[PDB]
Design a protein around this nucleic acid. Structure first.
Ligand SMILES: [K+]
Ligand SMILES: [K+]
Ligand SMILES: [K+]
Ligand SMILES: [K+]
Ligand SMILES: [K+]
Ligand SMILES: [K+]
Ligand SMILES: [K+]
Ligand SMILES: [K+]
Ligand SMILES: [K+]
Ligand SMILES: [K+]
Ligand SMILES: [K+]
Ligand SMILES: [K+]
Ligand SMILES: [K+]
Ligand SMILES: [K+]
Ligand SMILES: [K+]
Ligand SMILES: [K+]
Ligand SMILES: [K+]
Ligand SMILES: [K+]
Ligand SMILES: [K+]
Ligand SMILES: [K+]
Ligand SMILES: [K+]
Ligand SMILES: [K+]
Ligand SMILES: [K+]
Ligand SMILES: [K+]
Ligand SMILES: [K+]
Ligand SMILES: [K+]
Ligand SMILES: [Mg+2]
Ligand SMILES: [Mg+2]
Ligand SMILES: [Mg+2]
Ligand SMILES: [Mg+2]
Ligand SMILES: [Mg+2]
Ligand SMILES: [Mg+2]
Ligand SMILES: [Mg+2]
Ligand SMILES: [Mg+2]
Ligand SMILES: [Mg+2]
Ligand SMILES: [Mg+2]
Ligand SMILES: [Mg+2]
Ligand SMILES: [Mg+2]
Ligand SMILES: [Mg+2]
Ligand SMILES: [Mg+2]
Ligand SMILES: [Mg+2]
Ligand SMILES: [Mg+2]
Ligand SMILES: [Mg+2]
Ligand SMILES: [Mg+2]
Ligand SMILES: [Mg+2]
Ligand SMILES: [Mg+2]
Ligand SMILES: [Mg+2]
Ligand SMILES: [Mg+2]
Ligand SMILES: [Mg+2]
Ligand SMILES: [Mg+2]
Ligand SMILES: [Mg+2]
Ligand SMILES: [Mg+2]
Ligand SMILES: [Mg+2]
Ligand SMILES: [Mg+2]
Ligand SMILES: [Mg+2]
Ligand SMILES: [Mg+2]
Ligand SMILES: [Mg+2]
Ligand SMILES: [Mg+2]
Ligand SMILES: [Mg+2]
Ligand SMILES: [Mg+2]
Ligand SMILES: [Mg+2]
Ligand SMILES: [Mg+2]
Ligand SMILES: [Mg+2]
Ligand SMILES: [Mg+2]
Ligand SMILES: [Mg+2]
Ligand SMILES: [Mg+2]
Ligand SMILES: [Mg+2]
Ligand SMILES: [Mg+2]
Ligand SMILES: [Mg+2]
Ligand SMILES: [Mg+2]
Ligand SMILES: [Mg+2]
Ligand SMILES: [Mg+2]
Ligand SMILES: [Mg+2]
Ligand SMILES: [Mg+2]
Ligand SMILES: [Mg+2]
Ligand SMILES: [Mg+2]
Ligand SMILES: [Mg+2]
Ligand SMILES: [Mg+2]
Ligand SMILES: [Mg+2]
Ligand SMILES: [Mg+2]
Ligand SMILES: [Mg+2]
Ligand SMILES: [Mg+2]
Ligand SMILES: [Mg+2]
Ligand SMILES: [Mg+2]
Ligand SMILES: [Mg+2]
Ligand SMILES: [Mg+2]
Ligand SMILES: [Mg+2]
Ligand SMILES: [Mg+2]
Ligand SMILES: [Mg+2]
Ligand SMILES: [Mg+2]
Ligand SMILES: [Mg+2]
Ligand SMILES: [Mg+2]
Ligand SMILES: [Mg+2]
Ligand SMILES: [Mg+2]
Ligand SMILES: [Mg+2]
Ligand SMILES: [Mg+2]
Ligand SMILES: [Mg+2]
Ligand SMILES: [Mg+2]
Ligand SMILES: [Mg+2]
Ligand SMILES: [Mg+2]
Ligand SMILES: [Mg+2]
Ligand SMILES: [Mg+2]
Ligand SMILES: [Mg+2]
Ligand SMILES: [Mg+2]
Ligand SMILES: [Mg+2]
Ligand SMILES: [Mg+2]
Ligand SMILES: [Mg+2]
Ligand SMILES: [Mg+2]
Ligand SMILES: [Mg+2]
Ligand SMILES: [Mg+2]
Ligand SMILES: [Mg+2]
Ligand SMILES: [Mg+2]
Ligand SMILES: [Mg+2]
Ligand SMILES: [Mg+2]
Ligand SMILES: [Mg+2]
Ligand SMILES: [Mg+2]
Ligand SMILES: [Mg+2]
Ligand SMILES: [Mg+2]
Ligand SMILES: [Mg+2]
Ligand SMILES: [Mg+2]
Ligand SMILES: [Mg+2]
Ligand SMILES: [Mg+2]
Ligand SMILES: [Mg+2]
Ligand SMILES: [Mg+2]
Ligand SMILES: [Mg+2]
Ligand SMILES: [Mg+2]
Ligand SMILES: [Mg+2]
Ligand SMILES: [Mg+2]
Ligand SMILES: [Mg+2]
Ligand SMILES: [Mg+2]
Lengths: 96, 146
RNA sequence: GGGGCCUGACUGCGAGGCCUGCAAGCCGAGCAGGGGCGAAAGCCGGGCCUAGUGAACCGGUGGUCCCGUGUGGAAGGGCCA
RNA sequence: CUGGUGUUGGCUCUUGGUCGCGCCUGCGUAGGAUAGGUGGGAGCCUGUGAACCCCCGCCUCCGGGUGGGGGGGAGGCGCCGGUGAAAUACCACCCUGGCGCGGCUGGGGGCCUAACCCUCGGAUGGGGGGACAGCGCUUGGCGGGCAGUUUGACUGGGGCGG
RNA sequence: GCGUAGGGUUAGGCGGGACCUAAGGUGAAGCCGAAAGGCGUAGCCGAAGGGCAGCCGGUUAAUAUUCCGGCCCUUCCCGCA
RNA sequence: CGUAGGGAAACCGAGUCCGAACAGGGCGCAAACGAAAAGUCCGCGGCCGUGGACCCGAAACCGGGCGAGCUAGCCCUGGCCAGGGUGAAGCUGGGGUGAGACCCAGUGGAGGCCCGAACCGGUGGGGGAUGCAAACCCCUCGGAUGAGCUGGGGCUAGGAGUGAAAAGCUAACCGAGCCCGGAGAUAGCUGGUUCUCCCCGAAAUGACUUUAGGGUCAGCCUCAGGC
RNA sequence: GUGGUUCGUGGAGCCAUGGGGGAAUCUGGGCGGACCACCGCCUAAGGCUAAGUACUCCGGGUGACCGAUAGCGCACCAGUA
RNA sequence: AGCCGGUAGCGGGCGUGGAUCCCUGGAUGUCCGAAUGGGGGAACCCGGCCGGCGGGAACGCCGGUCACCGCGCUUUUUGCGCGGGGGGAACCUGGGGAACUGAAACAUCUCAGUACCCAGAGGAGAGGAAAGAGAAAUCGACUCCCUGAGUAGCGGCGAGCGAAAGGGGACCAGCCUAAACCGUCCGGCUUGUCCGGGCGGGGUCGUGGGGCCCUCGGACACCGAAUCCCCAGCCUAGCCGAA
RNA sequence: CGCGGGGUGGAGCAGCCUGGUAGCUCGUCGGGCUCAUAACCCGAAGGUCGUCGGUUCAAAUCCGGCCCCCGCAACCA
């Protein structure tokens, strides 16, 4: 899709880069201040998982967190027919 | 990363005891080279189902034999050879001893693997052993009538 | 200016006023506790006097009855310094 | 630009840290001499093996220490006996640095290939790189390339000076 | 060249299209991106470039390589040799 | 809302707070002879808060779009440059020499070469200046086979493009285009503010102020109620 | 590492979540504002659910709503010239 | 009882055998536009296939059909089938997300999750049966109003920002599933009391509930939709109506 | 304030390890050699080895606070 996980649906979120000058008030620290707050994207740790399923090779773009979910989907094996677009089946219709 | 193996792998051993290893090894060398599968609850159950599926037949192959091997040491088959004295004109081999058991009491044998090198001439008294893995000794007398 | 013992460069307050746009700044007798010097009358809450200074917020430190998010604590605060 | 991690694996070689058992080294005349602290302290040690030799390995204030093969055929040592604080047998606790084994471990250097990357008119394949690079999260840094701002008042105008 | 009204532009061959490609655009395969979207070999679109068969006169108030006159060619389809 | 206040609070209460304190002080509590009133609730009016808050006005800021039919660059494809002049290399011939270099003739026809039209410019001067024209006219002048001019078809843009570089150009004003929007931005500034009568009637000083042509407190005017 | 909540790192829990590690199924689990015990309240990681609510291109009603410089930009062939 | 629109006129017609006109449905509906056979400089240009028409093979016209995507079927889609494209005043949820301005400068802060961009839904959308609140052995889904309250707090503790429980009201209903055990169909196989995916059963709760056993006698009596069906009622033209 | 390390002769450095030498360097003095002087060689002088209070045979060689400089990032209402 676009920098998203095919398995977890995890997609890049928006977070703030907060620069802080000061000693922590919990350290005799008159206070923490804030010099800047700007926008940044956090990107899911995406990786290629390339598996040979029954006929041909099948390539995923999964979050590294959900990698074994591929190999547990690799378990389900029946319907040894058409093209490398088997994931259509390996996908949600497995999990649904 | 617990995988069940298929064959020896020399420290990370043999034919199907389970062991876990670094996940990179598994998903790039061990499962891709088709010599292990991770221990999914189903595969973890399927193996245990096939551990006994063999080990009962193993406990049965060693029950099929020692059932016969137990009802064999209670008989005695005679061999009435045209034999003159203390020496057979013909001979007795395994194949013939098979024939003896096959119709003196009605039991079949290999007949091979019966401790018979150089089939036995020479009327007398003999006790030979048999197979499978645990095995059975059998006695048989060679006699003479016309 | 020189000796002699002493530490009131005290704690709790403060009638009444100077000054003053506010906020400050200033003088102050007297009462209570406990003391110091004096025979005592009396003096003493720093220095002959007028400059030597910095609201509040934010924290630090030392104590203290106070608060402690269901309750006993603890965290963290307030109060005095 | 960078450390730590994820993706990220194999075989090794190598050291560091800690801990526990075992083994240990320490020496100016100096109860008799080349004893680490202090406590215990009338005696040990040898039966299958005691001094001296055989040579080995280790340390050396090179004096001596010390374990192993043995020749070995049995006394070797102890204290009182102080011209040193202490007393050297012995079994311990423990400091010192060390070796070893084991556990826990961090740092290095290799080789490998199968991730990942690049390639190959040909590919569930070949060649090259190679667990690096890249990319995800995170740590610190350089950073006018860019962004947002600040840059006092009085004043014979303003500035400059004050 | 203005107001009202009527008339007036005739093509197989001239120009462009039932041809070709160029920059560029678009774009199955594919790749990427919070979304909108961005790229992208092939293919397709794209012309004042490539390709392709018409020359001289007459005629009308106003059209003519266009209607007419003469000579002259191009494609398709179907027949025969 | 009001009937209870003091205290940072624990609390206590006609008081409480600090305090050893029943010294002290702070802030609190207290009928006018059935009427009137604490307090509240509507209505009206003055003023303040918050909102575009008396009206009109910026230079600018940001969001999403629209623009290279002007101009700048480059890509694809076509086109144009009268006519004259100078005369490179190289050939060729001859002289030369050991063989050469080289010298000389003829031929040849090179060049961000020369004079100069078209075409592209815009040097000086004059005119023009509610113009013929929001850049023009005349005289003169520059280049004119090259880094040349040009028709058509294309791509690149707003903190971006393009730029033989002037901060030039990006649709007649570019030290950051245009349109719509946030938007009634903000303006301690300038301007403006509408019937009539009646009584009163100022100040331009002081204190503090990133304050000095702006404010807050005081002063001076006015009104109500009380003495 | 951040967002949300009144919460701007604060004693900062709760609900979300990009990265790393990574469970259990009643004697299991989350919460009562850090943390520990006690005492309590709830059942996470699957999904749908009318009505009460918002708006007004449209139709109708009502006006101490305008009356052609007003009232929508447009009472008229206006998003027109 | 008149009618052939704004609109008369010329030149002609229709209407008590009920015209014009108004309501409901139906038919025709060139081209463009999501535009969908293919192109394209919207409203133009060029086709394949089946049938038709003309003398009709070339040319042309006519009717029909042919975009792409997703999904379920199935023989790897050679096919069929339903669905999706786009528009919509404002409202709605999500994904992104400013600045002037205020702070009498400005950076945290504010303006504000606003303006705006994008995606989706509908006549509403969101949310919704508690891993909830929070001190009363206490409430009970969600949305909205009123209050709580400018309180609790948040805060260069600056300018500023600002809840919730509770209480009163509007409306008011809660329901499916995954999992255990049972059946099964096809599968794969290192055939098995195994694994597994598709379906059917079962079962859905916090005082804990369910499953499989064990005992009990449990019952269809009662319950009953948000789904379908009929109906009154309403909307889409009208009519009577004193003096 | 808190942590890392320092303060030995008139200047600095080894001894801060496993408590039993306080030395090195340049500088200054007497002396020899060189015309000489620097050089070179010889000898001698200067140290409480930052403070106190100890563990002990002894300690500058261990500790604890101290005290100054240097060192450490850090920090500021
Ligand atoms: K991988
Ligand atoms: K490869
Ligand atoms: K790496
Ligand atoms: K002047
Ligand atoms: K292209
Ligand atoms: K052409
Ligand atoms: K009082
Ligand atoms: K006022
Ligand atoms: K701009
Ligand atoms: K313009
Ligand atoms: K918080
Ligand atoms: K949770
Ligand atoms: K709770
Ligand atoms: K709860
Ligand atoms: K709903
Ligand atoms: K008028
Ligand atoms: K108007
Ligand atoms: K009728
Ligand atoms: K057609
Ligand atoms: K939004
Ligand atoms: K700002
Ligand atoms: K201001
Ligand atoms: K400003
Ligand atoms: K906000
Ligand atoms: K079911
Ligand atoms: K099954
Ligand atoms: Mg950060
Ligand atoms: Mg920022
Ligand atoms: Mg900001
Ligand atoms: Mg993980
Ligand atoms: Mg790992
Ligand atoms: Mg007073
Ligand atoms: Mg006295
Ligand atoms: Mg402040
Ligand atoms: Mg307490
Ligand atoms: Mg508590
Ligand atoms: Mg991981
Ligand atoms: Mg290598
Ligand atoms: Mg390779
Ligand atoms: Mg900088
Ligand atoms: Mg700047
Ligand atoms: Mg600004
Ligand atoms: Mg400043
Ligand atoms: Mg000034
Ligand atoms: Mg001046
Ligand atoms: Mg100045
Ligand atoms: Mg100055
Ligand atoms: Mg004319
Ligand atoms: Mg005319
Ligand atoms: Mg013709
Ligand atoms: Mg012709
Ligand atoms: Mg045609
Ligand atoms: Mg074409
Ligand atoms: Mg083409
Ligand atoms: Mg494109
Ligand atoms: Mg042409
Ligand atoms: Mg032609
Ligand atoms: Mg011709
Ligand atoms: Mg002609
Ligand atoms: Mg003409
Ligand atoms: Mg002709
Ligand atoms: Mg009083
Ligand atoms: Mg913009
Ligand atoms: Mg142009
Ligand atoms: Mg151009
Ligand atoms: Mg010409
Ligand atoms: Mg010429
Ligand atoms: Mg010429
Ligand atoms: Mg020239
Ligand atoms: Mg010239
Ligand atoms: Mg021109
Ligand atoms: Mg020019
Ligand atoms: Mg000129
Ligand atoms: Mg002039
Ligand atoms: Mg000229
Ligand atoms: Mg000239
Ligand atoms: Mg020239
Ligand atoms: Mg050229
Ligand atoms: Mg051109
Ligand atoms: Mg053009
Ligand atoms: Mg823009
Ligand atoms: Mg813009
Ligand atoms: Mg130029
Ligand atoms: Mg311009
Ligand atoms: Mg605004
Ligand atoms: Mg304005
Ligand atoms: Mg401003
Ligand atoms: Mg008067
Ligand atoms: Mg004035
Ligand atoms: Mg001013
Ligand atoms: Mg005033
Ligand atoms: Mg009066
Ligand atoms: Mg926040
Ligand atoms: Mg937060
Ligand atoms: Mg938690
Ligand atoms: Mg908790
Ligand atoms: Mg609690
Ligand atoms: Mg649920
Ligand atoms: Mg929902
Ligand atoms: Mg009126
Ligand atoms: Mg009227
Ligand atoms: Mg009008
Ligand atoms: Mg009028
Ligand atoms: Mg109309
Ligand atoms: Mg008529
Ligand atoms: Mg109809
Ligand atoms: Mg037609
Ligand atoms: Mg189209
Ligand atoms: Mg079309
Ligand atoms: Mg074409
Ligand atoms: Mg046909
Ligand atoms: Mg026909
Ligand atoms: Mg047709
Ligand atoms: Mg058709
Ligand atoms: Mg159709
Ligand atoms: Mg839509
Ligand atoms: Mg759309
Ligand atoms: Mg729709
Ligand atoms: Mg949102
Ligand atoms: Mg979205
Ligand atoms: Mg401001
Ligand atoms: Mg709804
Ligand atoms: Mg409250
Ligand atoms: Mg509210
Ligand atoms: Mg209810
Ligand atoms: Mg089921
Ligand atoms: Mg059911
Ligand atoms: Mg139970
Ligand atoms: Mg009537
Ligand atoms: Mg009537």
């Amino acid at each position: 899709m676009s920098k998203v996980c095919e398995i977890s649906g995890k997609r890049p979120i928006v977070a703030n880069s907060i620069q802080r000058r000061g000693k922590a008030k919990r350290e005799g620290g008159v206070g923490k201040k804030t010099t800047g707050i700007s926008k940044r994207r956090q990107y899911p740790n995406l990786q290629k998982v390339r598996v040979r399923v029954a006929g041909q090779e099948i390539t995923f773009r999964v979050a590294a967190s959900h990698i074994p979910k591929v190999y547990e989907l690799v378990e389900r094996a029946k319907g040894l027919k058409l093209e490398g677009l088997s994931p259509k089946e390996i996908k949600k219709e497995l999990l649904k | 990363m617990k995988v069940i193996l298929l064959e020896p792998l020399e420290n990370l051993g043999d034919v199907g005891q389970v062991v876990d290893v670094k996940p990179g090894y598994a998903r790039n060398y061990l499962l891709p080279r088709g010599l292990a599968v991770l221990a999914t609850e189903s595969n973890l159950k399927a193996l245990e189902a096939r551990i006994r599926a063999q080990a009962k037949r193993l406990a049965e192959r060693k029950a099929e034999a020692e059932r016969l091997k137990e009802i064999l040491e209670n008989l005695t088959l005679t061999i009435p050879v045209r034999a003159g004295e203390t020496k057979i004109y013909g001979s007795v081999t395994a194949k013939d001893i098979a024939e003896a058991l096959s119709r003196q009491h009605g039991v079949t044998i290999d007949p091979k693997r019966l401790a018979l090198e150089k089939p036995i001439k020479e009327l007398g008294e003999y006790v030979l052993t048999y197979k499978p893995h645990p095995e059975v000794p059998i006695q048989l007398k060679v006699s003479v009538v016309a």
